[PDB]
Amino acid sequence: DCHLSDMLQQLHSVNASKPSERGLVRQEEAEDPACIPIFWVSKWVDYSDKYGLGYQLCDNSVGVLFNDSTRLILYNDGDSLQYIERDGTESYLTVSSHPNSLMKKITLLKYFRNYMSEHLLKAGANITPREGDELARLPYLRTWFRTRSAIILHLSNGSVQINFFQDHTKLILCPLMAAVTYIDEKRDFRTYRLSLLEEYGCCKELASRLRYARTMVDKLLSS
């Protein structure tokens, strides 16, 4: 990923500046609502022991990255699908066409949609995403993994989202904007330009999560 490499450079640069080591932190100066993401993962379900990783994006679309490395996405109209084969060959179809070869995968996607609707809360439900470019592409989950502390979700638009288990905090990193959105323990959401965190500083909490992010982005790059 060229986006991952860019992301690693941006995280290298903010972390090398040691942004929490400042007499007065002024992280509010680094905020930019123009940079609020269009897409992030709002719900996820790890059924990787049998089927794959089901997820919802903040626009209510649902996707799955299956164990066989294919991906199926159901748009928020409730009928349009995008199917992505193992070589990343994509095609579009509808649920209403009931294609026999995809019936199992559609059934699994509907299972995740139902589970998520009944049993999970929507991350960032208090946030209105920025106005997208009208022709922006809905991303899919490119890769993910879990560590003891977090789940790391790499979207096909280059975004990397890290969800921390212990405190429910989350980072959404966007390399095109060179921005980070941090959702804290109390669900307050702020979006910052990474370069401006270098200049103005940030709290030790964000600084530490940004160190952790760099290591996660290195893991993404090596695998």
Curated annotation (Swiss-Prot):
Region (Important for interaction with phosphorylated proteins): 168-170
Cross-linked residues, Glycyl lysine isopeptide (Lys-Gly) (interchain with G-Cter in ubiquitin): K122
Effect of H168A: In pincer mutant; loss of centrosomal location and decreased interaction with phosphorylated CDC25C and BUB1
Location relative to the cell: Nucleus; Chromosome, Centromere, Kinetochore; Cytoplasm, Cytoskeleton, Microtubule organizing center, Centrosome; Cytoplasm, Cytoskeleton, Spindle
Tissue specificity statement from the Swiss-Prot or TrEMBL entry: Placenta and colon.
Residues with Phosphoserine modification: S5, S80
Induction description: By growth-stimulating agents.
Taxonomy, superkingdom: Eukaryota
UniProt effect for mutating V45A: Loss of centrosomal localization and of S-phase progression
POLO box domain ranges (all copies): 40-118, 140-222
Phenotype for L57A: No effect on centrosomal localization, nor on S-phase progression. Loss of centrosomal localization and of S-phase progression
Post-translational modification: Ubiquitinated by the anaphase promoting complex/cyclosome (APC/C) in anaphase and following DNA damage, leading to its degradation by the proteasome. Ubiquitination is mediated via its interaction with FZR1/CDH1. Ubiquitination and subsequent degradation prevents entry into mitosis and is essential to maintain an efficient G2 DNA damage checkpoint.
Chain positions with Phosphothreonine modification: T128
Function, in words: Serine/threonine-protein kinase that performs several important functions throughout M phase of the cell cycle, including the regulation of centrosome maturation and spindle assembly, the removal of cohesins from chromosome arms, the inactivation of anaphase-promoting complex/cyclosome (APC/C) inhibitors, and the regulation of mitotic exit and cytokinesis. Polo-like kinase proteins act by binding and phosphorylating proteins that are already phosphorylated on a specific motif recognized by the POLO box domains.
Family note: Belongs to the protein kinase superfamily. Ser/Thr protein kinase family. CDC5/Polo subfamily.
Annotated domain remarks: The POLO box domains act as phosphopeptide-binding module that recognizes and binds serine-[phosphothreonine/phosphoserine]-(proline/X) motifs. PLK1 recognizes and binds docking proteins that are already phosphorylated on these motifs, and then phosphorylates them. PLK1 can also create its own docking sites by mediating phosphorylation of serine-[phosphothreonine/phosphoserine]-(proline/X) motifs subsequently recognized by the POLO box domains.
Self-association and partners: Interacts with CEP170. Interacts with EVI5. Interacts with FAM29A. Interacts with SLX4/BTBD12. Interacts with TTDN1. Interacts (via POLO-box domain) with the phosphorylated form of BUB1, CDC25C and CENPU. Interacts with KIF2A. Interacts with CYLD. Part of an astrin (SPAG5)-kinastrin (SKAP) complex containing KNSTRN, SPAG5, PLK1, DYNLL1 and SGO2. Interacts with BIRC6/bruce. Interacts with CDK1-phosphorylated FRY; this interaction occurs in mitotic cells, but not in interphase cells. FRY interaction facilitates AURKA-mediated PLK1 phosphorylation.
Protein name per its UniProtKB record: Serine/threonine-protein kinase PLK1
Organismal lineage: Eukaryota, Metazoa, Chordata, Craniata, Vertebrata
Gene name as annotated: PLK1
